[PDB]
Design a protein around this nucleic acid. Structure first.
Lengths: 180, 157, 98, 138, 79, 41, 154, 48, 67
RNA sequence: GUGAUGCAUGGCCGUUUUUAGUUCGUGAAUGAUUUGUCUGGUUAAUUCCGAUAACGAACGAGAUCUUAACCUGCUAAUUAGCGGCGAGUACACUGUACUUGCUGCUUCUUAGAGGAACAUUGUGUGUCUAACACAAGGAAGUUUAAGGCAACAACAGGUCUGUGAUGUCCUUAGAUGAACUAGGCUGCACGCGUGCUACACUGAUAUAUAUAACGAGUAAAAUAUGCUUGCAUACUUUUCCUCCGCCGAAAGGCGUAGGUAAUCUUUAUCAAUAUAUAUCGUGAUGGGGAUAGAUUAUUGCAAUUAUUAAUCUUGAACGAGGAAUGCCUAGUAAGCAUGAUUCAUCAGAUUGUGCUGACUACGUCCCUGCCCUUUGUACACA
């Protein structure tokens, strides 16, 4: 039936850690062709998690100076990223991006002692770190932000060291080790 | 041949013109209405063109400009309000008050509702000035007309 | 026959009288016209001096006007109107035949 | 035979009129296909799968779409066509299938039948933002 | 110069006489009055002087005067 | 600093990463081989 | 790719039923093939609008614009130079001062409409003051739309 | 004199006789200071 | 949200006159308040009648401290 | 008298202050005073429940109304809509896009009025009282939300430069009244704000469809005559938005349709973020526009101090940002424009309107700032 961009129905979803699935809350209710839907998230708390993970990605990619708020071209950039990802690696772009989000989130943060991270803000911080990596890769890295974000996604998914989100997680855990 | 909206603005500004004219001239008696003694102002306007709270405030001004004592003057004003039949009254006279320090006082009776759209629709207010020897005395007088029925009132028979 | 004013009660009562008289005279009368409201709004600054927080306030005037048509004598319709109309309402006349 | 219905939601208002025909559906001088957004074309299409094209093959529905944003027009035309088809079922063609028609539309969602009252609020005082004001300098 | 003609005084003397109520407008730059084919810039000062002569009264307003004639001015200004 | 040219899975980014070329010359070579962004065949 | 499965019964009796975006390209191709109009050489050094600030850099922008104009004439048959300028309005950046909308140049549109009038595809009349399509042009564009529909369908 | 029918010198407030803060909005030809108190009698009622 | 002393004394003063007409149906209990009540605001009538219904559903399972 | 005095005043306003506080009658407890006005629970709030030397009251809070919203097949159609047929322009086959005119009708374009939403119904939390949750119908369950009215008391807060509101003092022919020529607040080592445009490829660029609403709109030209292009006089209406057709790259100019306005701009529809395809594919780059002269036209008697303005040449910072520091919880942040005000001309100002509709709450007192209680004071202009 429903197919994202008329391409992916994501009929298979990795189990993740049984909490990220509800955090992303992607299902037939959340299915859509293109990002930038009209879903509400400020009448409750659960609805904020109910917004789909790809929607959160497109609406978090937009922050850099003048580019702020251009979520139509957030749609464009994520579509191009999916297109290039699907044949740079054979995996479904949504699925590989899901594993990337799964392993790109810090689990314990030592702000003030250490605190376990809730699944919601674990997802939010994984997305935030991915967005910052993509921004610093649009910073003076020759290649286009399409390839920058795609490389960040695949690097997070395969757990390689060249990923800024993983480096920031390592920094956080290093602070945790130093405190404890 | 003028626009209806500009015509409405002209009606409003002329309403203000005649209202201030009536305030200026009518200072010796009440209000007998408006015309759509008499000879003077009718000829003036034709040549130029071709229990009431206002009454109570002007009456206090009348009792005040001549040098009568403020306390008894205002007290008699509130007696007049009560004998007229108002629910309450509020008379403020602020200014020099015989001293070099500005001063005001308040004389409240009844509820004296003071906020809300029904409060505006029910309360009548008036303001006036009195020219004195070394200053201006500002008088604000508020009377609430007796209650259509007030929103708050509830009584079942 | 179009009327204009700013408050709604006056136009309501005069239109009521108008169609009551129309029913009395059993004449060719067009249907009522119920125009969308037209509002005049201005916004002005409080605080006559230049001191204090900049506070403004807004105003509104809702102008009300409607239209009707009747097939009767101009003299008789103007008399029956001027008998029971408040001069605060402005009314103009257009006749109809068929 | 003929019945007129309306759909009002967001800024846009759409009007439909369902008559007897052979399946002629028109959007002003255009059709439902030349709107541009293929994403919202299927959103409008969802009632077609929910109900059936074979029965639309016997009914002609004209549509006038006018005013507001493109998303609002799509939503309004969805509302108008849903109300028109429910009225035509209640009046002319059949009621027993209309019993399941409401059951399927409401099963899918409540949005198709009735629009939303979400609209912009009067922007307040203080500054450029609706709830935000000019920067404070001490 | 702006010398005030005697006849210029006279026509307005008869003009205010034949009505009894007039508004001469505080502004003087307007060449003509709606009810006077005469330069008002020769009449406001005369009316103000007759006012200071305690024969006419003026309630005064904004951009309008509203003078009112009294009983003891007609005999004086008639000749 | 750009150094890619046209002198030496048919999508622009894939061909660009394979041949170390600019996206424009990559699209040119793609059209040459086959014969804004669109869904793939 | 651009085609989709039509779920209703079409008419295809005129040109609005066909896609406008490709129909204007097809008309531009036919215009270049038959050389019905001139370029004209007079306008090859003037930007389309004040805020455009750049050359169209396509060499066929007159044909593109004329195809657009005919699409406009059909879609709404009572136009003018002001309406056309408003529809062709684009942004204009005043340097430090904020960007504002601005209309296009009127001479290019006047020349295009005069060329169309000479071709006879569009006419003028006091009644229906705006530019209107003639009956011969109506039938010709009807058959052209049907030809394009058949070409892109079968 | 050098009078003209142009600019701010051609009109002023009809009460205060001042050229400052004069609104031509619907040709009221009034100053804001006096208008903010004449509004009620004029018909300008603050609502929302 | 809580309630207002005015609507509270209104609810207390009513019922005591025509409890006989007052029944179980919530909308009928609303209509009897519309009939017996002289509150001009329709919303205020609605609120007071709701408070009366809440007061009613406290009876016949214990004391109601009045009536 | 825009001369002084807001520390002589009036009125208005801005703050304490959008919070929850303030007062009275009678009673009670050398005096200032206290209680009422509170241990506690709850909250939109002294809002209620309740305890109670207090009982009973008044203000403030509460409440009302406009906005989107559903219906009243209510009430109906002007300047609106629905049709039907009168002739069709091309297509199907046993209505279709575009036009002409009248009228079977008024949900639809809309407003007069009213209704509808009241913890509504149950499964729960609560001293079973006040209070709060879930789920459902419903457009409406945080008052459905956003708008305004803001008590008592106070500041020696601002304004006598808004007023012929105003006292006192001062001045008037070398005016402190008025007019007229020219000049200034637009200049700049710097500073701080309000704000405007960048650092791009989520973008620089050319095409076009799908675009809204608040809006806002009518004592002057020229012609002729006389004297000698200027003066006086007689004639129409030029003196708002403007469509259109022409001239001009443009700026702008010429002549007319229409409108004192749901009728003409424009509205079967006006902006931008779009859009889909295409040049470019992060190279201080083509980004970016600080930056000049040359000009052309308008506004105004007057644009020099390049008012405003299209054109070509001019080519800084800027690689996401110092010490510091501001604002903000849903059709709303932000981005993007745009209407209105002042306006002869001039938004980079203010106020409204809308589009795209986001990263993250059902909270906390850690800073800051308030409110209540107790407590200590040698403070009371606190």
């Amino acid at each position: 039936d429903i197919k994202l961009f008329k391409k992916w129905s994501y009929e298979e979803i990795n189990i993740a850690d049984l909490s990220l699935v509800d955090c992303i809350a992607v299902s037939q209710k959340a299915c859509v062709y293109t990002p930038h839907t009209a879903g509400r998230y400020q009448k409750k708390r659960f609805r904020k998690a109910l917004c789909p993970i790809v929607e959160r990605l497109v609406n978090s990619m937009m922050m850099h100076g003048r580019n702020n708020g251009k979520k139509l071209k957030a749609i464009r950039i994520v579509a191009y990223a999916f297109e290039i990802i699907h044949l740079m690696t054979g995996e479904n772009p949504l699925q590989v991006f899901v594993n990337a989000v799964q392993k790109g989130g810090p689990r314990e943060d030592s702000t003030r002692q250490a605190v376990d991270v809730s699944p919601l803000r674990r997802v939010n911080q994984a997305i935030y770190l991915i967005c910052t990596g993509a921004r610093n890769a649009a910073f003076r890295n020759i290649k286009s932000i399409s390839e920058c974000l795609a490389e960040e996604i695949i690097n997070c998914a395969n757990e390689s060291s060249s990923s800024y989100a993983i480096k920031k997680k390592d920094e956080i855990e290093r602070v945790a080790k130093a405190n404890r | 041949p003028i626009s209806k909206k500009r015509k409405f603005i002209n009606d409003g500004v002329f309403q203000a013109e005649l209202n201030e004219f009536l305030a200026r001239i009518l200072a010796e008696d009440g209000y007998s209405g408006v015309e759509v003694r008499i000879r003077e102002l009718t000829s003036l306007v034709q040549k130029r063109f071709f229990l009431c709270a206002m009454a109570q405030a002007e009456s206090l001004r009348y009792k005040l400009l001549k040098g009568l004592a403020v306390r008894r003057a205002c007290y008699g004003v509130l007696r007049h309000i009560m004998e007229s039949g108002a629910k309450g009254c509020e008379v403020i006279v602020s200014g020099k008050l015989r001293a070099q320090r500005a001063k005001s006082m308040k004389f409240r009776d009844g509820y004296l509702i003071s906020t809300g759209e029904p409060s505006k629709r029910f309360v009548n207010t008036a303001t006036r000035s009195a020219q004195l020897k070394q200053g201006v005395l500002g008088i604000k007088v508020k009377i609430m007309l007796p209650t259509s029925i007030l929103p708050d009132n509830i009584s079942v028979l | 026959i179009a009327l204009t004013s700013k408050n709604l009660r006056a136009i309501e009562k005069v239109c009521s009288d108008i169609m009551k008289g129309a029913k009395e005279k059993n004449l060719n009368v067009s249907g009522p016209v119920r125009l969308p409201v037209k509002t005049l709004r201005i916004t002005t600054r409080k605080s006559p001096c230049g001191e204090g927080t900049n506070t403004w306030d807004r105003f509104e005037l809702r102008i009300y006007k409607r239209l009707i048509d009747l097939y009767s004598q101009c003299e008789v319709v103007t008399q029956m109107t001027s008998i029971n109309i408040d001069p605060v309402v402005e009314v103009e006349v257009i006749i109809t035949d068929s | 035979k003929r019945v007129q219905t309306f759909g009002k939601k967001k800024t846009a208002v759409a009007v439909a009129t369902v008559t007897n025909g052979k399946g002629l559906i028109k959007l002003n001088g255009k059709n439902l296909d030349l709107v541009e957004p293929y994403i919202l074309k299927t959103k409008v299409y969802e009632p077609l799968w929910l109900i059936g094209s074979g029965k639309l093959k016997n009914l002609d529905i004209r549509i006038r779409v006018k005013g507001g944003g493109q998303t609002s027009q799509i939503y309004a035309i969805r509302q108008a066509i849903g109300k028109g088809i429910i009225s035509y079922y209640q009046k002319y063609v059949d009621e027993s299938t209309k019993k399941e028609l409401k059951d399927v539309l409401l099963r899918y969602d409540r949005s198709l039948l009735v629009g939303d009252t979400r609209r912009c609020e009067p922007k307040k005082f203080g500054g450029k933002g609706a709830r935000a004001r000019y920067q404070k300098s001490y | 110069y702006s010398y005030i003609p005697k006849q210029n005084k006279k026509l307005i003397y008869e003009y205010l006489f034949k009505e009894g109520v007039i508004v001469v407008e505080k502004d003087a730059k307007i060449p003509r009055h709606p009810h006077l084919n005469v330069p008002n810039l020769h009449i406001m000062m005369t009316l103000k002087s007759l006012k200071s002569r305690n024969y006419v009264e003026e309630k005064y307003n904004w951009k309008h005067q509203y003078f009112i004639l009294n009983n003891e001015g007609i005999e004086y200004l008639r000749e | 600093k750009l150094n890619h040219a046209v002198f030496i899975v048919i999508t622009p980014s894939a061909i660009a990463e394979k041949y170390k070329v600019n996206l424009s010359v990559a699209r040119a070579v793609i059209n040459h081989l086959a014969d804004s962004q669109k869904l793939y065949t | 790719r651009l085609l989709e499965p039509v779920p209703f019964v079409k008419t295809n009796n005129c040109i609005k039923d066909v896609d406008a975006d490709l129909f204007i390209r097809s008309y531009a191709t036919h215009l270049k093939l038959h050389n019905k109009i001139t370029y004209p050489k007079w306008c090859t050094f003037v930007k389309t609008g004040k805020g455009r600030k750049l050359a169209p850099l396509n060499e066929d922008w007159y044909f593109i614009r004329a195809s657009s104009i005919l699409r406009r004439l059909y879609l709404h048959p009572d136009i003018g130079v002001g309406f056309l300028r408003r529809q062709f309005s684009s942004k204009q950046r005043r340097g430090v001062a904020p960007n504002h909308t601005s209309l296009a140049s009127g001479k290019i549109l006047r020349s295009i409409l005069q060329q169309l009038e000479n071709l006879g595809y569009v006419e003028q009349n006091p009644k229906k003051k705006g530019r209107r399509l003639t009956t011969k042009g109506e039938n010709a564009i009807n058959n052209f739309a049907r030809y394009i529909n058949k070409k892109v369908y079968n | 004199v050098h009078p003209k029918k142009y600019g701010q010198g051609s009109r002023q407030c009809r009460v205060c006789s001042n050229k400052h803060a004069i609104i031509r909005k619907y040709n009221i030809n009034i100053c804001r200071q006096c208008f903010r108190e004449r509004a009620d009698i004029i018909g300008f009622k603050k609502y929302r | 949200r809580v309630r207002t002393k005015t609507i509270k004394r209104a609810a207390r003063q009513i019922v005591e006159k025509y409890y006989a007409k007052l029944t179980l149906d919530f909308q009928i209990n609303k209509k009897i308040t519309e009939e017996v009540a002289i509150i001009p605001s329709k919303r205020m009538k609605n609120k007071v009648a709701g408070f009366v219904t809440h007061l009613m559903k406290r009876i016949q399972k214990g004391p109601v401290r009045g009536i």
